Amino acid sequence: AKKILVTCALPYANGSIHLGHMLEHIQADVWVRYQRMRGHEVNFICADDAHGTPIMLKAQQLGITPEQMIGEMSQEHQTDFAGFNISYDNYHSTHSEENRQLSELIYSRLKENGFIKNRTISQLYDPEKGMFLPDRFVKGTCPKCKSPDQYGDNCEVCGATYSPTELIEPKSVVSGATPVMRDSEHFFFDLPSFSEMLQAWTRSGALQEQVANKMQEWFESGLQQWDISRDAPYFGFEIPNAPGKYFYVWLDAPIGYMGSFKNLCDKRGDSVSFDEYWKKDSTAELYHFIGKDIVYFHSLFWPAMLEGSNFRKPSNLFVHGYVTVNGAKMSKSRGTFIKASTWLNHFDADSLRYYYTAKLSSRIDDIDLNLEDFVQRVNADIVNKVVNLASRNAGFINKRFDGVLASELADPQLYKTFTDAAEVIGEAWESREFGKAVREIMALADLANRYVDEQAPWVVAKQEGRDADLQAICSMGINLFRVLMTYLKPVLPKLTERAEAFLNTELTWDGIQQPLLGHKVNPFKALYNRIDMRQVEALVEASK
Ligand SMILES: CSCC[C@H](N)CC(=O)O
Numbered sequence: 113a114k115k116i117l118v119t120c121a122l123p124y125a126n127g128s129i130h131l132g133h134m135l136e137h138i139q140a141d142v143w144v145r146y147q148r149m150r151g152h153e154v155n156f157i158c159a160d161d162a163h164g165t166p167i168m169l170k171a172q173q174l175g176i177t178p179e180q181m182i183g184e185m186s187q188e189h190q191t192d193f194a195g196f197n198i199s200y201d202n203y204h205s206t207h208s209e210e211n212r213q214l215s216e217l218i219y220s221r222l223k224e225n226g227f228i229k230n231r232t233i234s235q236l237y238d239p240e241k242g243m244f245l246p247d248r249f250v251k252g253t254c255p256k257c258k259s260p261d262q263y264g265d266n267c268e269v270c271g272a273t274y275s276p277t278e279l280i281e282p283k284s285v286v287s288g289a290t291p292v293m294r295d296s297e298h299f300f301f302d303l304p305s306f307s308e309m310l311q312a313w314t315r316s317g318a319l320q321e322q323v324a325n326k327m328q329e330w331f332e333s334g335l336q337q338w339d340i341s342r343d344a345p346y347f348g349f350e351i352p353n354a355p356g357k358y359f360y361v362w363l364d365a366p367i368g369y370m371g372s373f374k375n376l377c378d379k380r381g382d383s384v385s386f387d388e389y390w391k392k393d394s395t396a397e398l399y400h401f402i403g404k405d406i407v408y409f410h411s412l413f414w415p416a417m418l419e420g421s422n423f424r425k426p427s428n429l430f431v432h433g434y435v436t437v438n439g440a441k442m443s444k445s446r447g448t449f450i451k452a453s454t455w456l457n458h459f460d461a462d463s464l465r466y467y468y469t470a471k472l473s474s475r476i477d478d479i480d481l482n483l484e485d486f487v488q489r490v491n492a493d494i495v496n497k498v499v500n501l502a503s504r505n506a507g508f509i510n511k512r513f514d515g516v517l518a519s520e521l522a523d524p525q526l527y528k529t530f531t532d533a534a535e536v537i538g539e540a541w542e543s544r545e546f547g548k549a550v551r552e553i554m555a556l557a558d559l560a561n562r563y564v565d566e567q568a569p570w571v572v573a574k575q576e577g578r579d580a581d582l583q584a585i586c587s588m589g590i591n592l593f594r595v596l597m598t599y600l601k602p603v604l605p606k607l608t609e610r611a612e613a614f615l616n617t618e619l620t621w622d623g624i625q626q627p628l629l630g631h632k633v634n635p636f637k638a639l640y641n642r643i644d645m646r647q648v649e650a651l652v653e654a655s656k
C-alpha cells in the first residue's frame with residue numbers, strides 16, 4: 113500500500129561497471145523485489161552521471177562529441193545491469209532536459225531564498241588550452257622530495273600532501289603549458305544556514321548509527337559554503353543569467369534522481385506522480401542506496417538543497433561498505449579488479465547476487481568476495497541445499513507418478529514450521545539484514561534435507577508396494593522447495609523463473625499458505641550446476 117521511490121547512486125559515465133557498483137545495485141534490487149512482493153508501489157530509479165571536466169576532456173581526446181561518448185557508455189552500463197537482472201523502472205541520464213529544467217528551478221529557488229553567494233576565488237589556469245585546471249590535471253615536481261611527474265595534491269613517492277600551487281615547475285596535464293593563477297567569480301551554496309536542520313536529522317534515529325556518528329565529526333569540523341559553479345569550457349548545464357558559468361556536476365547529479373523520475377512519469381503520461389513523490393507534503397517514501405564515499409553529498413548538501421527549494425527530503429539513506437576481493441581492495445595487477453561484463457562471461461548473475469546477499473547487513477562494513485569461499489558457498493547452499501530439494505525428488509514424481517504431486521502433505525507440522533518463518537524472514541529483508549535472512553533460509557533448507565534423509569527415498573523407491581510412500585516423500589520435498597524459493601525470490605531471479613516453470617506456478621509471498629496438492633509439475637534439465645576453482649582462475653586471468 114506504500115509508495116516507495118528507491119535509487120542507486122548514478123554511475124560515472126566514463127568508467128565501466130565493476131563489482132563495487134554491483135554490490136550496490138544488487139543490494140537495492142533485492143530490497144526492491146521484496147517490496148514489490150509485498151504489494152507496494154515501487155519505483156526503482158537510476159541514471160548515468162554524465163557531466164564534468166573529465167568527461168569533456170575524454171571526449172575531446174577520443175575525437176567525438178561528449179553526447180556520443182556518454183550515449184555509448186550509457187548503453188554499456190545498461191547492458192551490464194540488465195545482465196544482472198537489476199529491475200529499474202527507469203534508467204535515465206543527468207544530461208537530459210528534465211534534469212536541466214529541475215537544476216535551473218532548484219538553483220533559482222535557492223537564489224531567491226538567499227542561499228546563493230558570489231565570491232571571487234583564485235585557481236590554476238592553463239592559458240594555452242584556456243581553462244581552469246582541477247587539481248588532478250596539474251602535474252609537477254614534489255616540493256618536499258623533488259620527485260618529478262607527481263599529480264594533484266599529493267606525492268606518490270614520499271607521501272607528502274600539499275596544494276598543487278606548491279608543485280615545482282607545474283605543467284598542465286591537458287597541454288603541457290605552465291599554469292598560472294587566475295581569478296574567477298564562483299557561486300556558493302550556503303550549506304551552513306542549514307546546520308540546525310541537518311543536526312536534527314542526524315539525531316532523529318533514522319540514519320545508520322555509523323553514518324550519524326560520522327556526521328557529528330563533520331559538524332565538529334564545521335560546515336562550509338559549497339562552490340557549485342565551474343567556468344567554461346565545461347560539459348554540463350549553463351547557469352541562467354551567468355554567461356560562461358556552469359553548474360558543477362555534483363550540484364546537478366542528485367537532481368538527476370528527480371530528473372529520472374520526471375522522465376518516467378512523462379513517458380507514462382502520468383501528470384500527478386512527480387508532485388506526489390517530491391512535494392513537501394508527500395506521503396511517499398524516498399530511499400537512496402549509496403556508498404561511503406558519497407555520504408557527504410547525500411546527507412548534508414542534498415537535504416539542504418531540497419529544503420531550500422521547497423521539496424521533500426529523503427526518508428532514509430542506506431549506506432553500504434566497499435567491496436574487497438580476497439580480503440583486499442580490488443587490484444588490477446592481481447586480476448581482482450573485475451568488471452561486471454567480465455563476470456558474466458564466467459559465472460551467472462545469481463551466483464554473485466546470492467554471495468553478496470549472504471554477507472550484507474544493515475551496517476556500513478566492507479563486503480568481502482573471497483573467491484575460494486564463493487565456490488564453496490554457492491555449491492553448498494544453492495546446489496546442495498536448496499536446488500537439491502527439487503533435483504532429488506522431481507525425477508521420481510515425473511517418472512513414476514506422471515508429474516503429479518500427492519493430494520496431502522506428508523508432514524503438515526514441518527510445513528508449518530516453514531511457513532511460520534515468513535514473518536522473521538520478511539522482516540530481515542525489510543530491515544536490510546540480508547545475511548540474517550539467508551541464514552534463516554538455509555537453516556530451513558537443512559531441516560528439509562534432513563527430512564528427506566530421514567525418509568530415505570533411495571530406499572523406499574526399491575521396495576515393493578511403497579509407491580504411495582515415495583510420492584508422499586518426494587511431494588513433501590518439492591513443497592518445501594516451493595517455500596524456500598519464495599523466500600529467495602528477491603535474491604535469485606533467474607533460478608526463480610526456472611523454479612516457477614518446473615512448479616507450474618508463480619511464486620507469491622502469500623501463496624506459500626496453499627501448498628501444491630494434486631498438482632502437475634514439469635520436467636527440467638539441471639536447475640543449477642556446480643562451479644569450480646578453475647572457473648575462478650579463468651576469471652582472474654581474464655581480468656589482468
Ligand atoms: C547522485 S550520485 C552520483 C555518484 C557519482 N557519479 C559517483 C562517482 O562518480 O564517484
Ligand SMILES: CSCC[C@H](N)CC(=O)O
Pocket residue numbers: 322323326404405406407408431476
Ligand atoms: C560514515 S560513511 C562516510 C565516511 C567514509 N569513511 C568516507 C569515505 O569512505 O570516503
Ligand SMILES: [Zn+2]
Pocket residue numbers: 254255256257258259267268269270271272
Ligand atoms: Zn614527494
